[PDB]
Design an enzyme around this catalytic site. Sequence first.
Site, PDB file in Angstrom:
ATOM      1  N   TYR A  77       0.839  -1.184   0.000  1.00  0.00           N
ATOM      2  CA  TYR A  77       0.000   0.000   0.000  1.00  0.00           C
ATOM      3  C   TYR A  77       0.886   1.251   0.000  1.00  0.00           C
ATOM      4  CZ  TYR A  77      -3.409  -3.590   1.072  1.00  0.00           C
ATOM      5  OH  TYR A  77      -4.192  -4.732   1.045  1.00  0.00           O
ATOM      6  N   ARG A 120       3.454  -1.263  10.966  1.00  0.00           N
ATOM      7  CA  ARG A 120       3.631  -2.535  10.259  1.00  0.00           C
ATOM      8  C   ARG A 120       4.417  -2.226   8.995  1.00  0.00           C
ATOM      9  NH1 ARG A 120      -0.876  -7.423   9.437  1.00  0.00           N
ATOM     10  NH2 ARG A 120       0.578  -8.977  10.254  1.00  0.00           N
TER      11      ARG A 120
HETATM   12  C1  LIG Z   1      -9.571 -11.209   6.440  1.00  0.00           C
HETATM   13  C2  LIG Z   1      -8.128 -10.709   6.465  1.00  0.00           C
HETATM   14  C3  LIG Z   1      -8.000  -9.338   6.358  1.00  0.00           C
HETATM   15  C4  LIG Z   1      -6.721  -8.780   6.485  1.00  0.00           C
HETATM   16  C5  LIG Z   1      -5.622  -9.579   6.695  1.00  0.00           C
HETATM   17  C6  LIG Z   1      -5.730 -10.967   6.633  1.00  0.00           C
HETATM   18  C7  LIG Z   1      -6.993 -11.511   6.603  1.00  0.00           C
HETATM   19  C8  LIG Z   1      -7.137 -13.017   6.720  1.00  0.00           C
HETATM   20  N1  LIG Z   1      -4.339  -8.976   7.029  1.00  0.00           N
HETATM   21  C9  LIG Z   1      -3.174  -9.832   7.312  1.00  0.00           C
HETATM   22  C10 LIG Z   1      -3.322 -10.319   8.747  1.00  0.00           C
HETATM   23  O1  LIG Z   1      -3.190  -9.273   9.672  1.00  0.00           O
HETATM   24  C11 LIG Z   1      -2.299 -11.421   9.082  1.00  0.00           C
HETATM   25  O2  LIG Z   1      -0.986 -10.923   8.899  1.00  0.00           O
HETATM   26  C12 LIG Z   1      -2.524 -12.673   8.229  1.00  0.00           C
HETATM   27  O3  LIG Z   1      -3.862 -13.103   8.375  1.00  0.00           O
HETATM   28  C13 LIG Z   1      -1.568 -13.791   8.641  1.00  0.00           C
HETATM   29  O4  LIG Z   1      -1.809 -14.208   9.958  1.00  0.00           O
HETATM   30  P1  LIG Z   1      -2.643 -15.606  10.224  1.00  0.00           P
HETATM   31  O5  LIG Z   1      -1.938 -16.742   9.507  1.00  0.00           O
HETATM   32  O6  LIG Z   1      -4.016 -15.448   9.622  1.00  0.00           O
HETATM   33  O7  LIG Z   1      -2.669 -15.783  11.713  1.00  0.00           O
HETATM   34  C14 LIG Z   1      -4.219  -7.518   7.173  1.00  0.00           C
HETATM   35  N2  LIG Z   1      -3.030  -6.997   7.353  1.00  0.00           N
HETATM   36  C15 LIG Z   1      -2.969  -5.684   7.731  1.00  0.00           C
HETATM   37  O8  LIG Z   1      -1.886  -5.204   7.970  1.00  0.00           O
HETATM   38  N3  LIG Z   1      -4.122  -4.952   7.824  1.00  0.00           N
HETATM   39  C16 LIG Z   1      -5.328  -5.448   7.575  1.00  0.00           C
HETATM   40  O9  LIG Z   1      -6.346  -4.787   7.707  1.00  0.00           O
HETATM   41  C17 LIG Z   1      -5.320  -6.703   6.992  1.00  0.00           C
HETATM   42  N4  LIG Z   1      -6.568  -7.335   6.620  1.00  0.00           N
HETATM   43  C1  LIG Z   2      -1.322  -8.493   0.255  1.00  0.00           C
HETATM   44  C2  LIG Z   2      -2.404  -9.235   0.978  1.00  0.00           C
HETATM   45  C3  LIG Z   2      -1.905  -9.717   2.359  1.00  0.00           C
HETATM   46  C4  LIG Z   2      -3.018 -10.048   3.346  1.00  0.00           C
HETATM   47  N1  LIG Z   2      -4.042  -8.968   3.287  1.00  0.00           N
HETATM   48  C5  LIG Z   2      -3.695  -7.781   3.809  1.00  0.00           C
HETATM   49  C6  LIG Z   2      -4.576  -6.740   3.763  1.00  0.00           C
HETATM   50  C7  LIG Z   2      -4.177  -5.420   4.412  1.00  0.00           C
HETATM   51  N2  LIG Z   2      -5.270  -4.433   4.513  1.00  0.00           N
HETATM   52  O1  LIG Z   2      -3.029  -5.185   4.813  1.00  0.00           O
HETATM   53  C8  LIG Z   2      -5.856  -6.902   3.180  1.00  0.00           C
HETATM   54  C9  LIG Z   2      -6.163  -8.162   2.592  1.00  0.00           C
HETATM   55  C10 LIG Z   2      -5.225  -9.192   2.699  1.00  0.00           C
END
Ligand SMILES: Cc1cc2c(cc1C)N(C[C@H](O)[C@H](O)[C@H](O)COP(=O)(O)O)c1[nH]c(=O)[nH]c(=O)c1N2
Ligand SMILES: CCCCN1C=C(C(N)=O)CCC1
Lengths: 359, 359
Positions: B182, B230
């Site tokens: 992003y 992050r």
């Molecule tokens: C539905 C959904 C939505 C998001 C995410 C993932 C998922 C499954 N992840 C990534 C998330 O925070 C995390 O790093 C990953 O899900 C990996 O961890 P787990 O293996 O699921 O425990 C994510 N990352 C982030 O930095 N901001 C966010 O808003 C999102 N949104």
């Molecule tokens: C690049 C996708 C990695 C996991 N996701 C992270 C998101 C995030 N908002 O950082 C949104 C959807 C999925």
Amino acid sequence: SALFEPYTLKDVTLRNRIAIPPMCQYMAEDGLINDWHQVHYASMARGGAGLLVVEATAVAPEGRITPGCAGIWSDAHAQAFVPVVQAIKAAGSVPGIQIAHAGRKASANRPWEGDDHIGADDARGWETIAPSAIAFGAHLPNVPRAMTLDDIARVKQDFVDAARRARDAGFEWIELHFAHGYLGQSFFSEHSNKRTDAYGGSFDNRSRFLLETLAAVREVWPENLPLTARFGVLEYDGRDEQTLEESIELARRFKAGGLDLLSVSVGFTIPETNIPWGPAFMGPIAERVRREAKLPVTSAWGFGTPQLAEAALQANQLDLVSVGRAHLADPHWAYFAAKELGVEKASWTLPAPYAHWLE
Amino acid sequence: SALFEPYTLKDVTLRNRIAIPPMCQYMAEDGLINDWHQVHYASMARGGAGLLVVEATAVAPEGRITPGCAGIWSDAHAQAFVPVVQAIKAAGSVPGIQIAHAGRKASANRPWEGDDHIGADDARGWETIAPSAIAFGAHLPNVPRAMTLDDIARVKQDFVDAARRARDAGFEWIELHFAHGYLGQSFFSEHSNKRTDAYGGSFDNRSRFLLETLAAVREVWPENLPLTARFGVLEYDGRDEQTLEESIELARRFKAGGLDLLSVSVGFTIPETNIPWGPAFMGPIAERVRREAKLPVTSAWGFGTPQLAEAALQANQLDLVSVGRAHLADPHWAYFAAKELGVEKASWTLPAPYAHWLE
Ligand SMILES: Cc1cc2c(cc1C)N(C[C@H](O)[C@H](O)[C@H](O)COP(=O)(O)O)c1[nH]c(=O)[nH]c(=O)c1N2
Ligand SMILES: CCCCN1C=C(C(N)=O)CCC1
Ligand SMILES: Cc1cc2c(cc1C)N(C[C@H](O)[C@H](O)[C@H](O)COP(=O)(O)O)c1[nH]c(=O)[nH]c(=O)c1N2
Ligand SMILES: CCCCN1C=C(C(N)=O)CCC1
Ligand SMILES: [Ca+2]
């Protein structure tokens, strides 16, 4: 999978055969529910269960088990349930409610606060009522006031009023709480009912409070929405053969009185019992009630293993499987069950923002 | 067990080392959160995690990923978060929020609605912005417009405004979203940043947007509440040795700029990569950042097995373990982990109305 087949009763269709049975939360104040309940019920409904029956909700203040019990004895109490009803429906589950009167087991502490009758010095307590002035005993020694004919008429009318309020809050399923040693169960059981008037002595007389209450409620509860009850069909008190015969006959009379489904449970009327707790131990009991009274049934008490639930359905012991404590542990238990039973697209048991990521 | 040790950072104490990372729900409308979010977040907080970081919340409308993304770009938007904050705190968890801008990955469909860039004829779409006019490619082909200097000043100020609002809404933990391809990540990466002004070219210049945004936020964010970010520290694009070295030097500069904790992730800046997905695969990377930049860290991406979480903490790879999808599956995952790891009185990871019965 039998557990994920829809079920239709009157105008209501459940998306699967998983029911969440009533489970008291003891978090209400003066009968009014609050954000504890709102989130609790909405989260479990999103978890995928087809039916969610809200906890024992008192028809009158003295009918609460504890100072934390929910009530529906005024229109303000009923209005508080509207957002719970609507959140359950928004999740695609069916909202039901159990309406109740705790009888001689009322005026007790919350389970994690002693679980015993409130003492006289304690200003949270109240006078209890029952068919006869006889105490449960053990941790519940308080002697109830024996109900008069006027009391019986008043309490019946409180169930009617509660049913009318449930209807207007939008509940699609009602359950009369005639089990677990509370007011209704105690009118049926010879252990607690020693009356010598029209409501004690014979089977017809002991049955009378339950049948009259059912018929009174039937007059205001919509004909097109399931009218159900929970009833303890045995006590494990050494009198099981005769007690169960009587219970099943009462179930036939419930059916003749318009009952759509019976939730089959244990009486808990007295403490001097030997209940053989175990996985799905009620299955064969429910099966006998179902087959002999010719009425749909659900039961609980050891079905949070997805295989046990599926087995009970395939054996035609149950029409719905009620899964309680496993949903306290995991509000998305229905998804877990779908995965464990190999349902196709099991993750879509849940709403899209979960399901997409879990498949 | 290490998993259930408290953690203190500035004035905030977490009851255990389980963090729920930000997870987009795609359920907001015009950036406003609603009953979806209220229950979602409240239920996970009651499940026992010590820290709950609310999903990526856009600092500006065009910085949403999708039309369902949450936003905090007005005081009305911020007020909608107040009941979420209150519910997370009431559950004994610490409320955090990730503030974000999707840069060139913006104007996309929800993941279950194609997950791709909204086409030009679809009126739901919008022009995207980025350091340089270069598309991500693959399923995100829309070319962003290159930001002006005024754009850069405006977006920095939007991050400030967002932090100010998050503060006033009661959040106790903030996370700047400089990861996952992003806007912030894309300023740092040579793949996406081809600028020839002060914000591109050299390492100092590529770092500038991120460091200036951190410093501007630091002016409004309370000194006694954790200020975190992050950041994707490598891409798995065949440039990992050099990319990781630069990322760690940037992490040192974040520390010098008042960063309290770094959430270590993957860049996802371009699609031409070979990410070695597997259980806890980020553990050794997070450990290296932690050790070499001397900053506390969390990470994610395969830690939802209780033993993997516990192992990462004991090896001092992480200070907090982020567990995402396992909490979508089971909002009470923290209780499941406490049981799996043999924590005493594990059920009392949950509130009394559950814990009493599950003991
Ligand atoms: C539905 C959904 C939505 C998001 C995410 C993932 C998922 C499954 N992840 C990534 C998330 O925070 C995390 O790093 C990953 O899900 C990996 O961890 P787990 O293996 O699921 O425990 C994510 N990352 C982030 O930095 N901001 C966010 O808003 C999102 N949104
Ligand atoms: C690049 C996708 C990695 C996991 N996701 C992270 C998101 C995030 N908002 O950082 C949104 C959807 C999925
Ligand atoms: C926290 C809690 C609270 C209640 C219950 C139990 C528990 C655990 N149960 C009994 C419940 O509906 C169910 O029959 C039992 O929990 C057995 O099913 P499980 O083995 O838990 O699936 C119950 N029964 C009932 O008829 N009305 C109720 O309100 C209550 N309240
Ligand atoms: C009745 C013995 C155990 C099951 N419970 C039933 C309750 C009920 N309201 O029917 C409340 C608590 C426990
Ligand atoms: Ca464009």
